[PDB]
Amino acid sequence: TSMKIQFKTAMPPTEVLLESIQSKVESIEQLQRKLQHVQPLEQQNNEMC
Amino acid sequence: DSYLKHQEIVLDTLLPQTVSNQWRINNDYIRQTCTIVEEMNIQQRKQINDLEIYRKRL
Numbered sequence: 776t777s778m779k780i781q782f783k784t785a786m787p788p789t790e791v792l793l794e795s796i797q798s799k800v801e802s803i804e805q806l807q808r809k810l811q812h813v814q815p816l817e818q819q820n821n822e823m824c
Numbered sequence: 825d826s827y828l829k830h831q832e833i834v835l836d837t838l839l840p841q842t843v844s845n846q847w848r849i850n851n852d853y854i855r856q857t858c859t860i861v862e863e864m865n866i867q868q869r870k871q872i873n874d875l876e877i878y879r880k881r882l
Contacts (some may be wrong), residue, residue, distance in 0.1 A: 799825060806828045813835035820842035824849070 803825050803828060806832060809832050816839055817835060820839060820846060824842050824846045
């Protein structure tokens, strides 16, 4: 009963969140990748400096 | 998400600060290279002058 009731609520809460937050995840996660390139260039410039 | 944008821009400011000082050091070197390269050119011309001068005397 719980598994049914709760997981149905979970799946609705998840898919409602996911719709709003998968977009914001991509927004947040594609920004993280920018740090990984902003760092890697930083070192080569410091090294070359 | 807003915090991550403040964190990102800070890195790229340092990318410029490094960029400027790196090009600035190379900029100073360039003048030195051109200063001496002329002086070496002056030396070689004078070198070649003697080389033939000493011959034409003898």
